[PDB]
Amino acid sequence: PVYVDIDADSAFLKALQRAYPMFEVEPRQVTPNDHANARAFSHLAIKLIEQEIDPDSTILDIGSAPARRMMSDRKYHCVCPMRSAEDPERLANYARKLASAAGKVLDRNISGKIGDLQAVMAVPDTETPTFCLHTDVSCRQRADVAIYQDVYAVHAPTSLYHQAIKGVRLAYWVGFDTTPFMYNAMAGAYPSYSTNWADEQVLKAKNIGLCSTDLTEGRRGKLSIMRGKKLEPCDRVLFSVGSTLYPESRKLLKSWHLPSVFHLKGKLSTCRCDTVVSCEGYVVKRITMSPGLYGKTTGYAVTHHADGFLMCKTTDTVDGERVSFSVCTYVPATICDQMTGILATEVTPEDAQKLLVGLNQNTMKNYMIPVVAQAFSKWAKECRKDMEDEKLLGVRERTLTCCCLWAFKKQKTHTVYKRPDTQSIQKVQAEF
Amino acid sequence: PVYVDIDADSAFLKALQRAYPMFEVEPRQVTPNDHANARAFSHLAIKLIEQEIDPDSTILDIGSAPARRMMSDRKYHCVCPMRSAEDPERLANYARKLASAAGKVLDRNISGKIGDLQAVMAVPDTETPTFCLHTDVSCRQRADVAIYQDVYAVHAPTSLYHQAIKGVRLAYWVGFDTTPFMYNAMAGAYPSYSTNWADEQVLKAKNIGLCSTDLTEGRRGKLSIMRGKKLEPCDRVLFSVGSTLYPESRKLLKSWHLPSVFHLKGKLSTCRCDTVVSCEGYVVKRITMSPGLYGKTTGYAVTHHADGFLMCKTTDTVDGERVSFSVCTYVPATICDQMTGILATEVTPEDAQKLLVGLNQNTMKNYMIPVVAQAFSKWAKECRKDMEDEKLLGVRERTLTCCCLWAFKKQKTHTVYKRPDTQSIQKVQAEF
Amino acid sequence: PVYVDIDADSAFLKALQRAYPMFEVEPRQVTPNDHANARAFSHLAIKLIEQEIDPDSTILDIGSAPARRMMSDRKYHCVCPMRSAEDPERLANYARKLASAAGKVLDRNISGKIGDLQAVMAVPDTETPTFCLHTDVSCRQRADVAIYQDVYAVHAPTSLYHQAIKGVRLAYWVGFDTTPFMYNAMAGAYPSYSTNWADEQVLKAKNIGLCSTDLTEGRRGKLSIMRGKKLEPCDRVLFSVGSTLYPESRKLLKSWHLPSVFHLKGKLSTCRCDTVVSCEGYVVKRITMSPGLYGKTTGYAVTHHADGFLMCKTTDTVDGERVSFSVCTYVPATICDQMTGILATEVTPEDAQKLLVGLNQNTMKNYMIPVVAQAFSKWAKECRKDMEDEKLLGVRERTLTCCCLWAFKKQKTHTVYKRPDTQSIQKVQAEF
Ligand SMILES: C[S@@+](CC[C@H](N)C(=O)[O-])C[C@H]1O[C@@H](n2cnc3c(N)ncnc32)[C@H](O)[C@@H]1O
Ligand SMILES: C[S@@+](CC[C@H](N)C(=O)[O-])C[C@H]1O[C@@H](n2cnc3c(N)ncnc32)[C@H](O)[C@@H]1O
Ligand SMILES: C[S@@+](CC[C@H](N)C(=O)[O-])C[C@H]1O[C@@H](n2cnc3c(N)ncnc32)[C@H](O)[C@@H]1O
Ligand SMILES: [Zn+2]
Ligand SMILES: [Zn+2]
Ligand SMILES: [Zn+2]
């Protein structure tokens, strides 16, 4: 009987129950959290991890908040490298809770957790069995299972290797789906979790999920020192999960988009990465490690789309300058199935938006209805073009460019639309 | 009373109950598996195999996961050649299970399986009665029945001969239907199992089940070193069963499309291959083995279509380059029977898609709906052409090409549509 | 109380009950057999044969599987020539079953059947009372009744004479209706049994029951060594009953289309052939023997059509080459009676197909609806021409071709449509 701090009549509830069929999910709202869905998913993911693994095993959780691991009889190595700015306050709250139940609870090893804390504030390199202050690439504990809950700011292969050489055979990564970042989107949204994200180059946009601009009359533009001439995604992006900000990096996010099979080649030598939980943009990936190189890797990563996924071209204004960039999002499967019949023809963005609103009135958040409509209007258009320019079966028409090279014409692809029950396949680096 | 890890209200349930009338299939969902239908079908296939064969017989299963064979009183030779990269993790889980029930269960010969495991990790050539680490062409155990559960990456005649010389009289192959690869399709889908497969040449496509492309403006194409000038399916294909990747080969897949009667001719010398279970793209084939050469072989293989099967030409964009290739899929029999009345005429693909959507709103997955529409729109067109160009009865009009040869005009065949209650007959190699 | 391994709600059930009024047919599905109707008909045919004949008589069954004849107190001479490739496997299964009830059942003479088996695998010419390994024209057993269940690959007069000189007075042939093959059809279908059959020259066709072709762009045809110039049925045909292949010969199949009265003239010298069971393409014919020559023969064979029978010209593509050939099938009597009103006029194949589908939506299989429509569209057309070109009563207009010969004009006959309650009369050879 798992309890979730969400509304008793929230639409996400059902989806959550579909994501965790082995648990009886019951709502109990005690906080008007702006991102309660994320916390509920994280709670059920942790409960699933505890259920699925060995009860007698030390559990190290990378970059974790020690306050959340309370009331858990399982041994936890709450790794707190003290790197981020939020960590001192998390430790303060954890110490407050640890000092508030000295003679209240005894089965949760709190009596030894007090000693562990007193030890770690004596010598900075104090590797207590249950708590330490080091990064994941420097901790010396030798446990069996690793946990990365909402940990995106770290290189996945390096950390996985560092725990693999540390005896960790199982790793769990609970976090946002990394498929949008393998598509190189300038901005995107997880509407089911009230989450938005955007590259720093479009944080001053107008009509995206995470942006803020100013009223202007259409004056002369900035005498920019840099010409620009190109708007391409940069490494630094901003995540707004409710009203909370996280600065993330595209390289580190893509590092966690591990293929199904990959190799770890360092001092010690195959590994697997499978998506065991996937709900409306939040995923739980079960990585498992095994010493010795066995088999061979294709370097291919697969994402299965229960709901529709879109990455489309859209025109906005950044600081008042009209530009076009890519925006990604998720659309519920019911909406995608109801849109199949209409999308057989060329539909204008306005009619598509009106039909989408009619199907909504809310299954999907209205704030991203327009762009999706445009996406569909592009998709149904492009497919129609593929109807008109029917090529011969198995013939490529390439022109010899007066040299030893061959060139072809690339069509206009404005929308990438992964329908429900489809899969995105992306070539990724293996054999780290 | 067989229990299936599927939803309690899933549409596939009924089809599953229609595939195993001997059993009482009851749903019990404990995992949100992206490919639960595949595992349910495999489970019932194993149960059917166990019911239909001799209880007193050592049962060797080729390339099997030893964890699934637990709680089975029948003797199992779990052959684990340690070739793929997922196998060490399977052995780790199997050893965990074998060490977690030492004093718990005693009727499953686990006490002896522990000794077998400790034997196999002592000498690499330890052929224990219940476990060994060798390929199917090198193991020396002499049992009576062979099982190939989801084993596609092996040569069927070679493995069948190697087990026939080992005394194996019965072989079972549970896996995806191999008819699409005898048709040489570039890509295909088993929608009832959320499965999408594609040739490596078209993994960067736009609107197929297994693909992922990027947004482009229509720039100059790649200055390719190879001219191309032909798009034909290659040996390497990728399977996505839910969110799991499998690199398969066309030759080994076609090797398992055995004819009804074929001969094994080596050191020792008829064989039969029949499809005993067939459900919406997943088949269980019962190969029966017999020493000596008896009768004669036609070299013909037969596939019966309970549901409609389609392999049609479709135009997509691979890496932004517009090409045309073949895509195959299955369509429910109810849909095919409802489409029969209108397909007497020429119907545009848009009208076909709208009629398909009206008949769907879901019997079939919507992401396959458009292309099937195209297929039907092509098929109904081509049939109409055969109506217009009525030839004479038993006359072939071939022109003498000013030589001792004869030539004829080939018509445009863009769609192969095997309706329900039809059969595909393909000439394959016999007498290996 | 006969039990049939068919669905409890199958539409064939009623027809089966109409074909065996003396039995109580009850469904009991224990296998998802692709050709369960054929096996149910064979079971009831065998049981009807057993009921209708002398309980105290040795019953030799030609080319039979010995596993089927189990649980039958009647003495059986299961003749197994070992000619086909399926015989080692059926005998292996039979030995398994005989060895699995050595202390279970004792009223089925199994204790003596074990001795008979041990005898036949000692000397190859061991003619045991109940089992032997010889062809029907070499076995020396002298019994009273012969049974040919699904035995098409043998010459009817030769085998019938060979068992007539062996004292067999009664013979039963349970198999497929041979009327389509006396009409010399290139392809055909028994839809009620999911059965198709095609000549080897049209196995690469496009839109028939048993065919499989490939997508082509309409390129240059094969530089054939043979000119062709004629497409006529050949001796070798392929039968697909569900998903099982049988290579049959037209000569041996037509051999069993025996007339009502025929003579056997050899060393010993009338015989009768009557169709005692007929159901939707499956026939049980009762042949009765009498020594000596009595009466005289007309050489005429009669087939009574309870349901409509069609053989019509249709245009398809064999290996992409557009040709026209004959296709035969059966149509339910209700459909034919509903077809009578509108066939008084000329009806386009499209309208005929639409009205046929309206009458169907399934009484008849949809996959053969179009061609039948074409057939009807031709038939109602040709009849109309006979109405327009009204000749005189008893006058034959024939031109003297400047010689002692006379010639007439032959009309275009594209469809033969034997309506229900009609008979096909064919002149066949007698006095073998
Ligand atoms: C989201 S915050 C902590 C919340 C945590 N994900 C949870 O749900 O319990 C991410 C944390 O990762 C830690 N971190 C930063 N860099 C790290 C690294 N290189 N290795 C391990 N942890 C790190 C930071 O201290 C930061 O507090
Ligand atoms: C799908 S995985 C195992 C799962 C298995 N099909 C099951 O359901 O239990 C296929 C396995 O076949 C094994 N294999 C690969 N090549 C083989 C070969 N040549 N002979 C026998 N097994 C092989 C690999 O070790 C791989 O783990
Ligand atoms: C349809 S299969 C047997 C199944 C059998 N009719 C039944 O329903 O039980 C055809 C069989 O005819 C047998 N056969 C082939 N040639 C024969 C011959 N010349 N005389 C008698 N039987 C023959 C073969 O052994 C083969 O098994
Ligand atoms: Zn530590
Ligand atoms: Zn072995
Ligand atoms: Zn005999």
Author numbering:
A (entry chain G), B (entry chain E), C (entry chain C): 3 to 271, 273 to 364, 377 to 447
From the paper:
NsP1 is the membrane anchor for the complex, forming dodecameric pores that associate monotopically with the membrane in the necks of the spherules to gate their entrance. Enzymatically, nsP1 also has a role in addition of cap0 structures to the 5′ end of the positive-sense viral RNAs. NsP1 possesses both N′7 methyltransferase and guanylyltransferase activity and reverses the order of these reactions. Each nsP1 protomer is built around a methyltransferase fold common to SAM-dependent methyltransferases with additional insertions (membrane binding and oligomerisation (MBO) loops 1 and 2) and extensions (ring aperture membrane binding oligomerisation (RAMBO) domain) that contribute to pore formation, oligomerization, and membrane binding.
To better understand the initiating methylation step of GTP in the nsP1 pathway, we solved the cryo-EM structures of detergent solubilized nsP1 pores in the presence of a 100-fold molar excess of SAM or GTP substrates. Common to other N7-SAM dependent methyltransferases (N7 MTases), the SAM ligand binds in a pocket near the switch point of the Rossmann fold in the capping domain. The density for the SAM ligand is not fully defined in the binding pocket, where in maps reconstructed with symmetry, only density for the base and ribose moieties is clearly visible. In comparison with the apo form of nsP1, neighboring helices αB and C are very poorly defined and overall local resolution for this region is worse compared to the apo and other bound states. Contacts made to the SAM ligand are primarily weak van der Waal’s (VdW) interactions, involving residues I64-A67 from the DIG motif and P83, R85, T137 and D138 to the base; S86, D89, and R92 from the DPER motif to the ribose and residues R70, G151, and D152 to the methionine. The SAM base forms a hydrogen bond (H-bond) between N6 and the side chain of residue T137 in nsP1, which maintains a second H-bond with R85. The purine base is bound in the anti-conformation to the ribose, where the 2′ and 3′ hydroxyl groups of the ribose form H-bonds to the side chains of D89 of helix αB. Although the density for the methionine is quite poorly resolved, its position replaces the side chain of R70 in the apo form of nsP1, which is also poorly defined in the structure. Taken all together, these data suggest that in the absence of GTP, SAM is not stably bound, and does not satisfy some of the contacts required for correct positioning of the substrate for methyl transfer. The correlation between the presence of SAM in the active site and the disordering of helixes αC and αB suggests that binding of the SAM alone also induces significant destabilization of part of the nsP1 capping domain.
